A paper describes a structure:
Programmed cell death receptor 1 (PD-1, CD279), together with its ligand, PD-L1 (CD274, B7-H1), constitutes one of the most important immune checkpoints as therapeutic targets (Azuma et al., 2008; Francisco et al., 2009; Zhang et al., 2009). Immune checkpoint receptors play a crucial role in maintaining physiological T cell homeostasis, but also constitute a major factor in the escape of tumor cells from immune surveillance. Here, we disclose the first structure of the mouse (m) PD-L1 and analyze its similarity to the human (h) PD-L1. Our study indicates that while the amino acid sequence is well conserved between the hPD-L1 and mPD-L1 and overall structures are almost identical, crucial differences determine the interaction with anti-PD-L1 agents, that cannot be easily predicted in silico.
To fill this gap, we crystallized the N-terminal PD-1-binding domain of the mPD-L1 protein (amino acids 19-134). The obtained crystal diffracted to the 2.5 Å resolution and contained 10 protein molecules in the asymmetric unit. The crystal packing did not suggest oligomerization of the V-type domain of mPD-L1, consistent with its one-domain human homolog structure reported previously (Zak et al., 2015). Similarly to the human PD-L1, the mouse protein shows the immunoglobulin-variable type topology with canonical two layers of antiparallel β-sheets (ABED and GFCC’C″). Protein chains are well visible in electron density except for the two variable loops: BC (Val44-Leu47) and C”D (Leu74-Ser79). Several significant differences within the tertiary structures are noticeable, mostly in the variable loop regions (BC and C”D loops), which are distant from the classical inhibitor-binding site and do not participate in the PD-1/PD-L1 complex formation. However, a detailed sequence and structure comparison within the hPD-1/hPD-L1 interaction surface demonstrates a similar arrangement of Phe19, Ala121, Asp122, Tyr123, Lys124, and Arg125 between human and mouse PD-L1. The most significant spatial rearrangement of the key amino acid within this region is a dislocation of the Tyr56 sidechain in the mPD-L1 structure compared to the hPD-L1 structure, resulting in ∼7 Å displacement of its terminal hydroxylic group. In addition, three amino acids involved in the formation of the hPD-1/hPD-L1 complex (Ile54, Arg113, and Met115) are changed in the mPD-L1 sequence to Val54, Cys113, and Ile115, respectively. Although the sidechains of Met115 in hPD-L1 and Ile115 in mPD-L1 overlay relatively well in the superposed structures, this replacement introduces a branched aliphatic chain to the already crowded space.
Author numbering: 19 to 134
Write the structure that this text describes.
Amino acid sequence: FTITAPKDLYVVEYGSNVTMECRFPVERELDLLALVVYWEKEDEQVIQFVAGEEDLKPQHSNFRGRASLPKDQLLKGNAALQITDVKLQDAGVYCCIISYGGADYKRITLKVNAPY
């Protein structure tokens, strides 16, 4: 079991949206109840999807209502993190962690260009 992140780094503009791919193999048919997904950013949880239960942790989360896991991508084996209305603070090293049978992780860097 190994996850593939084709893009190692993403460069985006302040105020825009970004979707960071994180793909895992589905042999035959997907059992959401066996799937665990965490996205972190430098020892800070962005979002999690654990056996069908999603938690944004918007308890003073820095991504209160801007982070999501589109389920049309989850079902295709892509645990993509979508961040809307990006801010400078969002730049950094993200970690995508998946457990589906086995477990693996990939680091992904986000760069945010500011206005002039």
